[PDB]
Amino acid sequence: FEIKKICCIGAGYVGGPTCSVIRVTVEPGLKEVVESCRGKNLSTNIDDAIKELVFISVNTPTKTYGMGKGRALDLKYIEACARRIVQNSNGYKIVTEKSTVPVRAAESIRRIFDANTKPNLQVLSNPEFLAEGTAIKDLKNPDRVLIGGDETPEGQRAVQALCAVYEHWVPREKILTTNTWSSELSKLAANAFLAQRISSINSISALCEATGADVEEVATAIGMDQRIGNKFLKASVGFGGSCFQKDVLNLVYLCEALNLPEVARYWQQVIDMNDYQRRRFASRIIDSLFNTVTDKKIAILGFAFKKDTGDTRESSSIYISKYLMDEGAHLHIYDPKVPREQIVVDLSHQVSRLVTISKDPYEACDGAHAVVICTEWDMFKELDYERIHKKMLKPAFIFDGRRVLDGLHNELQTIGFQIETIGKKV
Amino acid sequence: MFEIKKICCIGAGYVGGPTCSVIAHMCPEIRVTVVDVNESRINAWNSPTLPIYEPGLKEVVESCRGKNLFFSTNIDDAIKEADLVFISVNTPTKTYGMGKGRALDLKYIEACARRIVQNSNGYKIVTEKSTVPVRAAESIRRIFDANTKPNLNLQVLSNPEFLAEGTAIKDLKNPDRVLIGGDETPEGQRAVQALCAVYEHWVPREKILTTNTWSSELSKLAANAFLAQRISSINSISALCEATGADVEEVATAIGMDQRIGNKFLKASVGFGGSCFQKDVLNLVYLCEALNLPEVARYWQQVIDMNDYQRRRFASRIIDSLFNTVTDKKIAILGFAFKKDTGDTRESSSIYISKYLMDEGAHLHIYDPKVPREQIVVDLSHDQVSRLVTISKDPYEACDGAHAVVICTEWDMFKELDYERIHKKMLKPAFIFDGRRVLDGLHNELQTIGFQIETIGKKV
Amino acid sequence: MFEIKKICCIGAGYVGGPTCSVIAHMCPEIRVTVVDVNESRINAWNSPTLPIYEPGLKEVVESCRGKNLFFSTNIDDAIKEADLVFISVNTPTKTYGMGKGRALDLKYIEACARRIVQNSNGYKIVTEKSTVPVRAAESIRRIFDANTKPNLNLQVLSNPEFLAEGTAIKDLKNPDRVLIGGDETPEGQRAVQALCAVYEHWVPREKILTTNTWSSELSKLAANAFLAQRISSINSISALCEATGADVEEVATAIGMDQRIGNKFLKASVGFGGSCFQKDVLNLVYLCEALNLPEVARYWQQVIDMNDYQRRRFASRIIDSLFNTVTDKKIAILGFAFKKDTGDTRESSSIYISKYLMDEGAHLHIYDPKVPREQIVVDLSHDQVSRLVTISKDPYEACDGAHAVVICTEWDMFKELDYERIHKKMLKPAFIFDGRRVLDGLHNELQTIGFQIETIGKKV
């Protein structure tokens, strides 16, 4: 068999870029690749696209209701696709799961297809591993491509059909084929391992503040062991993004459902440590400002969950801001890329009384008691802090939640700042 | 401006011996004296049979023993003459009192500090090489300052060791990094830079990391904790794989191909062993509680709880598969060392799996190709060992008339055994419990032979 | 030898007013200016009717107001010319955020410190008189140092107040002790001695206690906690008495005759009230948690828990005695102030007893001979107050047709009521719940009348 026509249900943060990179019917450099394929081999006419490989790339948010609230994934969008696919299909076609789903979700899709059969739909798993802000580079040269299918003669042929698609630009040795369940579980486990590195280095940062060690020195020493590696060891106010907390909590929920309470509380610590890192950072700001920040002006420099993006989902800036808002602080928030309308939505259910969105950092720091850096934007390293200090109330504080001002502490102390950062004793 | 010409190392053990032997091999113009109180251990270093077995160690000592490397019992004289003093004594877990089973016993470290400052005059650099709790150098600096002399300048540095068992000479000659910690003071940097010059004889400068004293001490603890956390994490996944139909080896491969995660230390097992992983993680946990960091303490405690859970559930799997009773049943234990290609049994998972089965009254026949039988007898004691434990001479003796074969160590020979022969003389039904994934790919044959084979991270 | 000649006090409330009035009365050659942002309160000090009532206070102000005692709204000038600045502003319990219900809100203190260091030049002594958390003076010193000027020398002292309601003038003129805390430095000791000289005009030298700044702040909190602990301890005994047949009044007398224990503050009650006991104990508990002293925190938490338990069990006793339902029943609440001879109701046990009975749907008729009716409505509000709460203007109206009479405040008139008249118009059986032991000695006469009389610390 040879795949010649590909359909992708879901043109969002994932479905769009993946298919942009065979008649395929559905970030820096993304606008360039689409323009080279739109019209030759690259609509809302969903049924005909199905009726002529089908990628499922719809959202799977954490359930905010009912049983499993705040932990389980909501599969209602996935099932809607599966019903619509089997309605419009005859013959052979390959349905491929790309959304991040719980383990054994493909069994549900196969149940729907078999119960609505006609006088041959193969289900595969193909998770996504791109990271926001670097998606195009990750899609062009991925670390690995993961494809899962059943270990039957019918299933193994569907795997090879999808492998042939990726082999046009992915080396054969970078394409890993496993069973359906191992593929789904690997996506969840991969994100848990990444988040665990951040929570582990953040746990060390608390130890450093109490011992006089430095988390940047410790991370470097840890990272030079090639069995550990030097990636994802940057201590921070807490990891954000739309997938780390969601996938770990889903993993925890899956373990509780499968009667693995030891495994559930093992991975629960990744989330608990991240929450503790946020709460103690907020309490440090509040304590340094003499235990009261009512009507005090505080500058929030950085609102995105990481640099070089406008995404704010589960950003630590949201939680740090809400902690200070509960104390009645006057927040002046600047982010060079996050839309100002988004900041208002994130801090909403108080926003009118306490939250002001500044158009430049110097406006936000004018007359403020403290500067709180939550995002590692490169521009924060280059601000004129002697100018900022002149218009700040005294004493003036800088709370660096990202280690971006390292090496600048002596100058900032000479200017008159009390500078505090994560993983460094005050 | 200073140059270290004479080195003394207090402690001629697994660390002091090989580290100083390698330092002498790369530094011909520097005398290295390794001292110890143990008289028999010192003479064994000057014997043809070295007290510790390390591949390549015997040849390195013999090329320097006599030139610039020496072993001796004269601790006071070696300290008097040295420009650099290594503290490489043991720091065992306290088995008593406050912090029992978690905190480190610093009595040997303090004895060194007392003996050093007494037999010392002038300028000397004292370097912590043993695994010590964070801020232990502060205690050493207090002992030196409270027993000072005119024109006595003792500088304290931290220089932890990261060698592993079986590849120490390989690790010492080509380290991933050399870690040195000292003060920010002018005296501190000069002592740090003097020790850098020693390592620069064979370690590139980009691989020599200098930090403050506390970061150095904590990094040794944190490094071992991060490594053990990877094993417990992949072991937690192995439990998930067994309950979902996934395979932990396939999942580990998929995870490890992310270059931010890396593909090392993802081999699921019945549980990690060795003399330092559980010891350093628990010490980390104890330090956090003492510093009022309960969140950090219970975070790293999960690494130990997961390792313990992996062991217990494996023993429960054996008992449950054997019709919920193993009383008076013969069970073969293949592998007793905590890893392959060694005779070390410290904190080996085989000890705990055996004790679980011994508590049920099972008749264990234990075979290990490298571990001495007297060590196994000591490990399973506090009798019970006489009634239940038999140490076999080859795997076929241990499997003769047994209900199950339990593989706990990844010895390569276990993969190459005659299982048709073992199956014929085993009681039926015959079980294989693979706690190391060493029999992967052999499941079809073993099942065709008639075995019920069960392994970690694979649905039965 | 520095000499304090002009005193400014920021805060003309219950503390700042009387304390400065007494200082002016006893120190005729010292100018005393009490300032405040509330103009209606400042004018009330200058009017022939004071804002706060204390016996003998009206005579003190009228004897000084115009000579050396002044009440102005010009805060900046009073700070400018003062040698000593009292901070006597409110420090309420935080009702929001971290530490809600336990920590103190320091925003008013900080407002003073910033305004002082802006309107100050030269040498000035700044004195904490408000009840502040421990190390609050460290925060004031940071504001002063971070906003320093040339020739600006601000010294920070602690000087808490211990006056009680009803005896403020007596306590200020003849205090058990005057407590002054300052830094143990020559600059601090000089500032301490200058403030002692002011009090030395009428306080014996041995009654003026000088400590470090932190001991002074902590002593204010601990003193109130010790007093509240005596009440909770004797209240805990009252529960034991009810279950054993002992009498809490006999036990308290027997305990109190030990001169090491003393006979003060051993009067069992439905629970202590007032604006400072619960707030200072809870603040102490919060301080111990922030400093990682959980044993000390739960030790002092027991004072509050026992006070809450004494209240809840008294309410449950009323409900249980009334055949387990009080829905739509008329209940008379005699006494709403937190103690007799005052109209203050802050944290009054009557508030909590009333809310418990309101949650059951009882019809409360509340009488207090001094509390304004509008205050009672505010205290019992969040509706529920309109349906259930009636404010009577004499006790007999409140007891007319009621099932029970609940005495929560020890007003002397409640002992002198006509209980035969009350019994005739009460529903039967008629109950009296004495939460203050005010009807002691009347139990036989009340039982003969037909009442079921129940009181704290006496078996029924």
Ligand SMILES: NC(=O)c1ccc[n+]([C@@H]2O[C@H](COP(=O)([O-])OP(=O)(O)OC[C@H]3O[C@@H](n4cnc5c(N)ncnc54)[C@H](O)[C@@H]3O)[C@@H](O)[C@H]2O)c1
């Ligand atoms: N960095 C990342 O964002 C990323 C990377 C890897 C994996 N993932 C996973 O990939 C999935 C895609 O999420 P996303 O971030 O791209 O969100 P998204 O914005 O793409 O949301 C899915 C969108 O699909 C559209 N859609 C089209 N047809 C639909 C249908 N029939 N039913 C429902 N929706 C339909 C909807 O408009 C919806 O907003 C998630 O499960 C996510 O966890 C995300």
Ligand SMILES: NC(=O)c1ccc[n+]([C@@H]2O[C@H](COP(=O)([O-])OP(=O)(O)OC[C@H]3O[C@@H](n4cnc5c(N)ncnc54)[C@H](O)[C@@H]3O)[C@@H](O)[C@H]2O)c1
């Ligand atoms: N793989 C490893 O075992 C390894 C790896 C890195 C670091 N470390 C750490 O290095 C340290 C050294 O461990 P080891 O395995 O070499 O221990 P060891 O048991 O070999 O002890 C070292 C030697 O010190 C001697 N000694 C003790 N007190 C002495 C004193 N007062 N004077 C003279 N000699 C004295 C002992 O007799 C012993 O022979 C430990 O704290 C360990 O945690 C171990």
Ligand SMILES: NC(=O)c1ccc[n+]([C@@H]2O[C@H](COP(=O)([O-])OP(=O)(O)OC[C@H]3O[C@@H](n4cnc5c(N)ncnc54)[C@H](O)[C@@H]3O)[C@@H](O)[C@H]2O)c1
């Ligand atoms: N018996 C007692 O009530 C008593 C006994 C000892 C200690 N204390 C403590 O004394 C303190 C004051 O108690 P109080 O009952 O007198 O309070 P209060 O509310 O009666 O008086 C405080 C006064 O300060 C004024 N004020 C507040 N902030 C100001 C500012 N920035 N500038 C100028 N004026 C300002 C207010 O308007 C008010 O008139 C509290 O901390 C209390 O705990 C109380």
Ligand SMILES: O=c1ccn([C@@H]2O[C@H](COP(=O)(O)OP(=O)(O)O[C@H]3O[C@H](CO)[C@@H](O)[C@H](O)[C@H]3O)[C@@H](O)[C@H]2O)c(=O)[nH]1
């Ligand atoms: O050393 C680090 C690395 C990251 N972070 C933070 O962790 C969060 C996640 O960062 P990153 O992983 O780059 O962002 P994502 O876009 O969420 O990418 C993750 O989530 C994707 C969706 O599941 C996966 O495909 C990717 O592999 C995985 O990296 C951000 O708030 C970062 O600031 C740290 O605090 N320290």
Ligand SMILES: O=c1ccn([C@@H]2O[C@H](COP(=O)(O)OP(=O)(O)O[C@H]3O[C@H](CO)[C@@H](O)[C@H](O)[C@H]3O)[C@@H](O)[C@H]2O)c(=O)[nH]1
């Ligand atoms: O993927 C893996 C890797 C290791 N292990 C187990 O982990 C334990 C320890 O393995 P290893 O790291 O080789 O042991 P050691 O030889 O004691 O070395 C460790 O302990 C030393 C003592 O501190 C450190 O210096 C080294 O850096 C550190 O690797 C053994 O029981 C292994 O079976 C696994 O189960 N899975």
Ligand SMILES: O=c1ccn([C@@H]2O[C@H](COP(=O)(O)OP(=O)(O)O[C@H]3O[C@H](CO)[C@@H](O)[C@H](O)[C@H]3O)[C@@H](O)[C@H]2O)c(=O)[nH]1
């Ligand atoms: O044996 C006793 C003594 C008192 N109380 C109760 O305790 C509370 C407090 O009474 P009291 O101490 O006289 O009232 P306050 O006017 O608040 O005075 C206290 O609170 C002040 C701070 O506000 C301190 O300065 C005083 O020293 C301290 O007595 C009231 O509800 C009393 O009914 C009892 O129940 N039993």
Ligand SMILES: [Cl-]
């Ligand atoms: Cl230090």
Ligand SMILES: [Cl-]
């Ligand atoms: Cl203990």
Ligand SMILES: [Cl-]
């Ligand atoms: Cl299956």
